[PDB]
Design a protein around this ligand. Structure first.
Ligand SMILES: [Cl-]
Ligand SMILES: [Cl-]
Ligand SMILES: [Cl-]
Ligand SMILES: [Cl-]
Lengths: 115, 115, 115, 115
């Protein structure tokens, strides 16, 4: 997959397991099409999201459903979810990894772009 | 204002000055109404966004327009913007501060809820 | 004070109140002298740490005692403390703000350097 | 290795490659013994740091030498280094992963503790 997502838990110090993740592509015009989705594994990683064939240039939104993750662990968190929005360019990097770190009232995300 | 937003710059180590910020409220149903907006000051803070009269319970989205901030500083960043989405509850805290820390390929946000 | 420290709590979504903070200066040579210290206020901020007279060039260590903060709130955290180490240059910025965001298993810090 | 360290770069959006990492153990008493060290690989990961035989209970310091990393990439950063200090307990988790995310004026670290 040219797009991978990895999620960590900063409250419990663990991979974020079984987190739902949705990818949308901005169709032109001008709304968010469901593009790909899945749930993180025991390592907190979500593999096989998409393929080079399906992953074309465009604006993508990665929605990590942090709210249900926390409730399943006994926590009612601040955020509804975590969102990451970016443009995929073919001149850009071949592989994108979206990494997220979750707390009850905070989150950080970073993009790791490689070849 | 019961809602304040503060933005820092982790690449240059400065307040994020003149960043555009938009707040939307999820109207029922089921879209994002423009609710309030403004630009951060020299301290990277955005004051007077709204009032207790206008700020009712609901789901709010705070969109920080990180892309134009970075381009104005000579940087073409990864993210289109930074988004923070949360529910305001009247049983909840009287004041919400959304703090964001921006990098070219990363951002973190935290909510500071006080009385 | 040319040095200020501000600490936030990402688990509870609050300023980090009454956190002990120690500043050391690397004496030449080659150990850490106690330079200044204090406890954050209700806003999570530590003001009046030092003065322009006392704050000379050198290597400084800011130790935030995150462990006792968390235990006082009923949490046994991962880290012993949070440390930030940097060089103050007179050609550099007049004011340094060290901002920290604490979780049970994580912390981030950023330096905000201004005039 | 029961201890692994992974480092990401938030300015360039890449694994942090060839970063020097030092682990010290607080000998009793009361100083920091060199315990283990190495340099991150192309994935930004540092494997084979130590073994279950050598990794006993105690207080450990992980020093990531962020300054030379940045200079090698043409950047003069704020921090001298990134430090992470924690207690290893045998009742604790079998494996510790220290993850760090670096910017010029900021860093975050998180501990991922697993079995
Ligand atoms: Cl709910
Ligand atoms: Cl563009
Ligand atoms: Cl203890
Ligand atoms: Cl130097």
């Amino acid at each position: 997959s040219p797009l991978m997502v990895k999620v960590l838990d900063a409250v419990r110090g663990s991979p974020a397991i079984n987190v739902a993740v949705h990818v949308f592509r901005k169709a032109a015009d001008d709304t968010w099409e469901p593009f790909a989705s899945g749930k993180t594994s025991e390592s907190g990683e979500l593999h096989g999201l998409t393929t080079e064939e399906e992953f074309v240039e465009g604006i993508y939104k990665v929605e990590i459903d942090t709210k249900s993750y926390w409730k399943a662990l006994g926590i009612s968190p601040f955020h509804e979810h975590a969102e990451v929005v970016f443009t995929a360019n073919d001149s850009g990097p071949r592989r994108y990894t979206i990494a997220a770190l979750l707390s009850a009232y905070s989150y950080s995300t970073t993009a790791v772009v490689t070849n």
